[PDB]
Ligand SMILES: COc1ccc2c(c1)c(CC(=O)O)c(C)n2C(=O)c1ccc(Cl)cc1
């Protein structure tokens with residue numbers, strides 16, 4: 001699993017569950033091509049988005065539908081989403097965990113890139 | 116000054132200076148139309164992006180060029196940018212302070228929204 | 232004004248107003264001696280905690296009463312406080328902006344340190 | 348495992364490995380009593396700090412030696428540490444993950460409290 005998304009809820013101190021996540025790869029014409037998507041699990045995790053063969057070097061956008069999440073909880077969100085855009089660079093072997101910590105008017109995102 | 120961007124460097128504990136910031140507004144055809152852009156000052160602040168008149172309702176995207184920032188400091192960062200997308204002025208005009216806190220492999224973005 | 236505290240509410244996208252902030256300085260006997268305290272203003276800022284003369288080298292602890300803040304807003308928060316401990320003025324006097332961003336179950340604390 | 352500490356490095360995008368973590372419980376005389384400690388693993392995780400029998404309701408301080416971590420990497424840190432102070436409240440069953448995201452001049456901490 002070369003790309004994992006973890007989403008947490010800083011309001012309730014919980015995994016952010018059932019959050020729609022879309023992954024896009026930047027196409028040669030500079031447009032975002034849908035690549036993978038899912039909903040975060042009960043652990044606020046989204047596994048199996050892609051495989052190592054599919055996850056080639058490129059620019060990726062991870063779009064987390066944070067707004068729908070906050071709408072489900074009845075809390076007015078600021079952001080339309082959380083958009084995590086990064087270069088997957090092959091180098092040595094790598095696994096990407098895109099973590100998002102969500103608040104209504106704030107999100108933080110971090111990459112954990114490991115061997 | 117209804118839209119301000121404040122960028123901080125979490126490695127140096129300083130304002131993130133001369134960070135390029137691009138603001139786009141979602142057009143009727145769902146494309147991102149260039150709305151405004153600028154550089155953060157020495158205080159890591161970007162003022163005068165827009166006006167009360169120009170800053171109408173819409174979905175705005177603030178794209179903060181964090182990559183070029185980190186690269187100029189000799190760091191290869193993870194993200195291409197910090198990018199804040201939001202509906203502005205849905206309940207009437209508000210003042211928006213978009214703050215980004217930057218680390219090479221992480222950023223947070225927060226909004227202070229106030230009613231003038 | 233060598234020490235400023237800025238508290239933001241990440242739920243409301245607003246300054247965190249009337250947040251009690253206690254500053255302690257580590258004494259020679261390793262105890263935390265009360266150094267200064269105050270409330271954040273309407274802008275979520277706390278100015279005038281100390282002076283250049285008073286704010287000597289040391290290890291300082293800034294304790295932000297986030298719990299009472301969230302409780303007054305009807306939220307039972309996780310943390311008792313946001314609490315920033317740091318060595319101040321080791322390389323000579325600096326200006327410190329301690330910023331805290333608050334969510335009921337999370338906070339970030341950042342320092343902007345500048346040379347006057 | 349009723350209390351888990353996870354520490355990440357926002358500079359290198361990695362688990363924060365070998366970070367000393369001390370857990371304290373507030374004693375009746377209002378002093379911090381050492382309760383548990385460890386060093387974060389290769390996954391930046393600290394498991395087995397306590398047991399459900401030991402982890403009674405109370406006020407806990409999780410102190411993360413962030414400064415030593417940054418000193419090891421040769422990066423000048425702002426904070427002496429990251430001090431996470433919270434009330435463990437029994438309620439229904441609970442597991443506490445104290446996560447810290449570390450930058451030299453910034454730390455964020457989040458609680459993930461689950462069943
Ligand atoms: C006026 O609104 C803000 C917002 C955030 C601020 C600040 C001011 C100042 C200082 C000031 O301008 O007074 C600092 C040091 N801030 C941060 O540390 C910070 C925290 C979270 C994020 Cl996501 C981004 C930046």
Ligand SMILES: COc1ccc2c(c1)c(CC(=O)O)c(C)n2C(=O)c1ccc(Cl)cc1
Pocket residue numbers: 006008097098099100101109110111112337353355390444446447448455456457459
């Ligand atoms: C429930 O347990 C957590 C909590 C946070 C986590 C992770 C796992 C992983 C999983 C991993 O990559 O190992 C990443 C990347 N997390 C973060 O980004 C993060 C976000 C906010 C804070 Cl305050 C601290 C850390």
